[PDB]
Every structure is written in C-alpha cells, then in structure tokens.
Ligand binder design. Structure first.
Ligand SMILES: N#Cc1ccc(Cn2cnc3ccccc32)cc1
Length: 291
C-alpha cells in the first residue's frame, strides 16, 4: 500500500488523552519557500477569483511525534505541533509541484516536509454495540478522493500548559466530527483512544491522527440517526457497516481499492492496535482462526 505509511503505532491498545503531551512552537512551522511565500499568495488569488465564497482557516501542523520507552510511567507520547492554514495547504501539499518542494526540503533542511503545510487530520475507527465499524461514501463532486469510501473525521482548527488544551481540542474534535457527520448524540460515544498516526503519500505526506471510539448504539440505530438528518445534515452520500470479524481481512477485499488513504490508515492501525491479540485466551485457534 504505497499511498499510506505508519508514522506512529501506539502501545497498550491505544493511548488516552491524559497520557499525551503537546509542544506547540513556531520552531514546528513550515519553512518559507525558497523563492518566497508569494507563490502561495498567487495560487490563493487565482482560486478566490473563481470561487470568491472560499475562506481561509488556521490548522495544526504535525512536525513529529516521539513515543516514550514502552512500559514506562509518566507521559507516553510527545506531539511537536506548529500552525498552518487551508491557504498554505492549497499552495504546497495540493500544488502540482509538491514533489519538487519535497526534493528541495531534503536538499536544504534534510527534511522532505520542511516546505509543506502538512495540516494534521483526525479519523475514527467507530465501533457499534453489535461489533461493526462505520464507513461513509464520499460525494463524486468533491476535489479530493471523489466517490471513495471514508471513516468519520476532519481537520481541526486552533482555539504542556497551552499543550494540554491542544491535546483536549484534538480528542474533542474527533467526537464533534462524529456528532456533526453521523448525527449521533455525544453521550452515546466513549472517550477516544489514540491508535497511531498515518501519512497520505498521495497528498505529499500529510498526516492524520487515527482514534478508536465505541458507540452504545447498534448499527441499525446508528443508520437511523444518520438518515434522520436528511441529505443536508451530512457531506457524505451514504453510510454502511462491516463486522469487526471481517475488518481483519479488509486489505484482501475489493473494498480496499475504494478506500481513501486516511481511511486505510485508520483500518491498518485498528487491526494492529485493537485487533492482533497477544494473550493465550484471545490467541487460541477457535477465537483467532489461521490465514
Ligand atoms: N488544511 C487542510 C485541509 C486539507 C484537506 C482538506 C480536504 N480537501 C482536499 N482538497 C480540498 C479542496 C477544498 C476543500 C477541502 C479540500 C481540507 C482541509
């Protein structure tokens, strides 16, 4: 799967909010482009002159993520974050010349990402009370991955001492994306666990944090809530469900070719971190069938 690379696999079946630190620093920002940020401004002007109802928004930038020695006490992960924007994204990661920016970043800074916006995405493996994962079909009319399968998520917007509020907004935002797109009540959702971070190589290496969330509703009740919003309550064009039993072999199915890269990241991390049992009981042949 060349369009997705794992940057982080979390320990202990995934990390809660209280075990994560963030360091939000201008040292974690994108570097100015070699010929100046005028190139980003030019692309933006052209876009507004065709679609003048577009607006910029601030985003978190992922610089890097360091895991503690496994089995240690104290904070288990440090996220190094800067700030970027939707405008910076359209001028860098989305640019036709994004591969040239990666090569220049290797040359100038020994970092393929130094000249890229790299806005941080969030995504969820959302499980139902009757043990299914939730999938959404993308409209065929949008710019990115038209007509492909996705999982719930989005790109959160800003506003360990500022750090702890930043971790809280990341965890909060994945629940809010589920309530906005799936139309579920907040009180039916567990606190998220971070599974890991996956990079989209079809979008010049921008990264998504992938979380596990458990819902107290069955698949039938989730479908009712989603549909009862009507066509205007969601950006997706349909919802569907796969048994957690069958998610194990999803990369061998015809569905795999229809999954967008960030949804592939979510399913790979779910399989490695929530699946793949380590103990004698769940590991026994009748409960973990070979092949
Ligand atoms: N920062 C950031 C960010 C990154 C990707 C996307 C999804 N996406 C992809 N292409 C798009 C064009 C227009 C609108 C949204 C779009 C949204 C925000």
């Amino acid at each position: 799967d060349p369009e997705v690379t794992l940057l982080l696999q979390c320990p202990g079946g995934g990390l809660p909010q209280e075990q994560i630190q963030a360091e939000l620093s201008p040292a974690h920002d994108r570097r100015p482009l070699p010929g100046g940020d005028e190139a980003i401004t030019a692309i933006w002007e052209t876009r507004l002159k065709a679609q003048p109802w577009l607006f910029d928004a601030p985003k978190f930038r992922l610089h890097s993520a360091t895991l503690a020695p496994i089995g240690s006490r104290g904070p288990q992960l440090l996220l190094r974050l800067g700030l970027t924007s939707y405008r910076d994204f359209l001028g860098t990661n989305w640019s036709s010349s994004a591969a040239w920016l990666r090569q220049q970043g290797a040359t100038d800074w020994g970092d393929t990402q130094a000249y890229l916006a790299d806005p941080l995405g969030v995504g969820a493996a959302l499980a139902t009370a009757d043990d299914f994962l939730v999938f959404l079909r993308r409209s065929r009319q949008v710019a990115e991955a038209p007509g492909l399968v996705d999982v719930p998520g989005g790109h959160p917007e800003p506003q360990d001492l500022a750090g702890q509020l930043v971790v809280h907004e990341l965890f909060s935002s994945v629940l809010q994306e589920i309530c906005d797109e799936v139309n579920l009540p907040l009180l039916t959702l567990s606190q998220p666990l971070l599974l890991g971070i996956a990079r989209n190589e079809t979008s010049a290496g921008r990264a998504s944090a992938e979380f596990y969330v458990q819902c107290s509703l069955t698949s039938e009740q989730v479908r009712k809530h989603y549909l009862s919003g009507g066509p205007e309550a969601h950006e997706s064009t349909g919802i569907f469900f796969v048994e957690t039993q069958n998610v194990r072999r999803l990369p061998e199915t015809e569905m795999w070719a229809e999954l967008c890269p960030s949804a592939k990241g979510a399913i790979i991390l779910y399989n490695r971190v929530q699946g793949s049992p380590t103990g004698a009981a769940l590991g026994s042949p009748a409960l973990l069938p070979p092949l």
